[PDB]
Design a protein around this motif. Structure first.
Motif, PDB file in Angstrom:
ATOM      1  N   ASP A 172      40.488  48.934 -36.252  1.00 15.38           N
ATOM      2  CA  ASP A 172      39.941  49.946 -35.374  1.00 15.38           C
ATOM      3  C   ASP A 172      38.588  50.427 -35.907  1.00 15.38           C
ATOM      4  O   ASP A 172      37.746  50.887 -35.132  1.00 15.38           O
ATOM      5  CB  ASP A 172      40.910  51.121 -35.241  1.00 15.38           C
ATOM      6  CG  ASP A 172      42.156  50.767 -34.410  1.00 15.38           C
ATOM      7  OD1 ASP A 172      42.035  50.498 -33.180  1.00 15.38           O
ATOM      8  OD2 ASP A 172      43.268  50.771 -35.005  1.00 15.38           O
ATOM      9  N   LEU A 211      35.955  47.646 -34.932  1.00  8.85           N
ATOM     10  CA  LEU A 211      35.756  47.843 -33.498  1.00  8.85           C
ATOM     11  C   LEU A 211      34.906  49.040 -33.146  1.00  8.85           C
ATOM     12  O   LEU A 211      33.977  48.912 -32.366  1.00  8.85           O
ATOM     13  CB  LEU A 211      37.099  47.941 -32.771  1.00  8.85           C
ATOM     14  CG  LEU A 211      37.253  47.181 -31.452  1.00  8.85           C
ATOM     15  CD1 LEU A 211      36.550  45.811 -31.441  1.00  8.85           C
ATOM     16  CD2 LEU A 211      38.726  47.015 -31.149  1.00  8.85           C
ATOM     17  N   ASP A 212      35.219  50.202 -33.706  1.00  8.66           N
ATOM     18  CA  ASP A 212      34.441  51.412 -33.464  1.00  8.66           C
ATOM     19  C   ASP A 212      32.960  51.334 -33.874  1.00  8.66           C
ATOM     20  O   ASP A 212      32.082  51.927 -33.207  1.00  8.66           O
ATOM     21  CB  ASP A 212      35.103  52.591 -34.172  1.00  8.66           C
ATOM     22  CG  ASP A 212      36.022  53.335 -33.266  1.00  8.66           C
ATOM     23  OD1 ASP A 212      37.261  53.194 -33.449  1.00  8.66           O
ATOM     24  OD2 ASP A 212      35.491  54.005 -32.324  1.00  8.66           O
ATOM     25  N   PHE A 244      30.085  49.881 -31.221  1.00 13.04           N
ATOM     26  CA  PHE A 244      29.722  50.526 -29.961  1.00 13.04           C
ATOM     27  C   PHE A 244      28.817  51.746 -30.113  1.00 13.04           C
ATOM     28  O   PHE A 244      29.035  52.565 -31.014  1.00 13.04           O
ATOM     29  CB  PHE A 244      30.984  50.965 -29.179  1.00 13.04           C
ATOM     30  CG  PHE A 244      31.948  49.873 -28.931  1.00 13.04           C
ATOM     31  CD1 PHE A 244      31.652  48.851 -28.042  1.00 13.04           C
ATOM     32  CD2 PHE A 244      33.168  49.846 -29.608  1.00 13.04           C
ATOM     33  CE1 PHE A 244      32.564  47.821 -27.819  1.00 13.04           C
ATOM     34  CE2 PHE A 244      34.068  48.810 -29.402  1.00 13.04           C
ATOM     35  CZ  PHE A 244      33.784  47.809 -28.495  1.00 13.04           C
ATOM     36  N   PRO A 245      27.835  51.893 -29.194  1.00 13.82           N
ATOM     37  CA  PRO A 245      26.990  53.090 -29.173  1.00 13.82           C
ATOM     38  C   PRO A 245      27.748  54.335 -28.655  1.00 13.82           C
ATOM     39  O   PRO A 245      28.915  54.232 -28.201  1.00 13.82           O
ATOM     40  CB  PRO A 245      25.854  52.691 -28.234  1.00 13.82           C
ATOM     41  CG  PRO A 245      26.439  51.683 -27.304  1.00 13.82           C
ATOM     42  CD  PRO A 245      27.471  50.932 -28.136  1.00 13.82           C
ATOM     43  N   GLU A 246      27.101  55.496 -28.722  1.00 11.53           N
ATOM     44  CA  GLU A 246      27.654  56.727 -28.140  1.00 11.53           C
ATOM     45  C   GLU A 246      27.804  56.655 -26.622  1.00 11.53           C
ATOM     46  O   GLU A 246      27.300  55.731 -25.977  1.00 11.53           O
ATOM     47  CB  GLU A 246      26.792  57.933 -28.531  1.00 11.53           C
ATOM     48  CG  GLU A 246      26.710  58.146 -30.060  1.00 11.53           C
ATOM     49  CD  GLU A 246      26.156  59.546 -30.476  1.00 11.53           C
ATOM     50  OE1 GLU A 246      25.816  59.703 -31.690  1.00 11.53           O
ATOM     51  OE2 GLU A 246      26.060  60.480 -29.604  1.00 11.53           O
ATOM     52  N   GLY A 247      28.557  57.597 -26.077  1.00 18.86           N
ATOM     53  CA  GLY A 247      28.764  57.758 -24.633  1.00 18.86           C
ATOM     54  C   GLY A 247      29.817  56.906 -23.966  1.00 18.86           C
ATOM     55  O   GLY A 247      29.751  56.639 -22.753  1.00 18.86           O
ATOM     56  N   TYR A 248      30.801  56.458 -24.749  1.00 18.03           N
ATOM     57  CA  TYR A 248      31.914  55.668 -24.174  1.00 18.03           C
ATOM     58  C   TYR A 248      33.295  56.273 -24.484  1.00 18.03           C
ATOM     59  O   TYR A 248      33.562  56.738 -25.599  1.00 18.03           O
ATOM     60  CB  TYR A 248      31.814  54.204 -24.601  1.00 18.03           C
ATOM     61  CG  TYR A 248      30.644  53.516 -23.960  1.00 18.03           C
ATOM     62  CD1 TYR A 248      30.823  52.720 -22.830  1.00 18.03           C
ATOM     63  CD2 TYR A 248      29.347  53.661 -24.489  1.00 18.03           C
ATOM     64  CE1 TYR A 248      29.744  52.118 -22.206  1.00 18.03           C
ATOM     65  CE2 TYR A 248      28.249  53.044 -23.895  1.00 18.03           C
ATOM     66  CZ  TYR A 248      28.453  52.304 -22.732  1.00 18.03           C
ATOM     67  OH  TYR A 248      27.389  51.684 -22.129  1.00 18.03           O
ATOM     68  N   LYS A 249      34.174  56.302 -23.498  1.00 14.24           N
ATOM     69  CA  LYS A 249      35.486  56.860 -23.757  1.00 14.24           C
ATOM     70  C   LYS A 249      36.528  55.746 -23.826  1.00 14.24           C
ATOM     71  O   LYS A 249      36.590  54.888 -22.950  1.00 14.24           O
ATOM     72  CB  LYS A 249      35.849  57.874 -22.673  1.00 14.24           C
ATOM     73  CG  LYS A 249      36.879  58.853 -23.146  1.00 14.24           C
ATOM     74  CD  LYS A 249      37.798  59.224 -22.003  1.00 14.24           C
ATOM     75  CE  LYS A 249      38.952  60.093 -22.523  1.00 14.24           C
ATOM     76  NZ  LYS A 249      38.488  61.149 -23.482  1.00 14.24           N
ATOM     77  N   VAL A 250      37.320  55.755 -24.890  1.00 13.66           N
ATOM     78  CA  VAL A 250      38.415  54.807 -25.048  1.00 13.66           C
ATOM     79  C   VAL A 250      39.517  55.165 -24.044  1.00 13.66           C
ATOM     80  O   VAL A 250      39.976  56.319 -23.981  1.00 13.66           O
ATOM     81  CB  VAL A 250      38.936  54.742 -26.546  1.00 13.66           C
ATOM     82  CG1 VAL A 250      40.134  53.754 -26.720  1.00 13.66           C
ATOM     83  CG2 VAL A 250      37.806  54.365 -27.455  1.00 13.66           C
ATOM     84  N   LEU A 251      39.870  54.182 -23.224  1.00 12.79           N
ATOM     85  CA  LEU A 251      41.011  54.271 -22.308  1.00 12.79           C
ATOM     86  C   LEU A 251      42.334  53.969 -23.076  1.00 12.79           C
ATOM     87  O   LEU A 251      42.278  53.471 -24.255  1.00 12.79           O
ATOM     88  CB  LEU A 251      40.876  53.262 -21.168  1.00 12.79           C
ATOM     89  CG  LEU A 251      39.659  53.334 -20.278  1.00 12.79           C
ATOM     90  CD1 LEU A 251      39.888  52.435 -19.039  1.00 12.79           C
ATOM     91  CD2 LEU A 251      39.322  54.775 -19.918  1.00 12.79           C
TER      92      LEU A 251
END
Ligand SMILES: Nc1ncnc2[nH]cnc12
Lengths: 113, 39
Positions: B25, B28-29, B32-39
């Motif tokens: 995790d 993976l984290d 990614f850039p800012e502004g994304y929500k994990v579903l």
């Protein structure tokens, strides 16, 4: 499979009101989904990251979902590219992010082909 | 003993295994850039 193939897919032209279940129906058809991240800011909404557990499922989704119609709108489905991913940073802070990722994880930090 | 062709198959298998390993995790984290929500 070509080097650019990746289990992370970056999605554009995604409807604003699409639900978590709709996202899993569309993309899950191609194999076990590791995780999905939906853009939820002014600059990122309309976009998403879709991660497969397996690379051959990810290849298959790309082959089949590019230009896929969902709510009168055609999806753009692209392989993750770390350079692209961190575009919206400034020169100095981006270079450090890419350096971190190449050093700690060995990912390609070149721009798309 | 593996022929040149069988070696190239063996090599692709190794390359393909390295590209299909499970990710933490934490790895993976980092991707990614800012502004994304994990579903
Ligand atoms: N291919 C890509 N991968 C990740 N983030 C992106 N932002 C723009 N293009 C991208």
């Amino acid at each position: 499979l070509p080097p650019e193939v990746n289990r992370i897919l970056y999605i554009r032209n995604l409807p604003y009101k699409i639900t978590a279940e709709e996202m899993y129906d569309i993309f899950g058809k191609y194999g076990p989904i590791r995780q999905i991240r939906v853009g939820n800011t002014p600059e990122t909404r309309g976009t998403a990251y879709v991660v497969y557990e397996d690379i051959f499922d990810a290849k298959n989704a790309v082959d089949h979902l590019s230009g896929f119609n969902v709510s009168n709108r055609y999806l753009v489905v692209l392989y993750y590219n770390a350079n692209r991913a961190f575009q919206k940073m400034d020169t100095k802070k981006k270079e450090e992010q890419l350096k971190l990722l190449k050093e700690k994880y060995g990912i390609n930090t070149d721009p798309p082909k | 003993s593996m022929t040149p062709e069988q070696l190239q198959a063996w090599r692709w298998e190794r390359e393909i295994d390295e590209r299909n390993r499970p990710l933490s995790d934490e790895e993976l984290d980092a991707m990614f850039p800012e502004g994304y929500k994990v579903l």
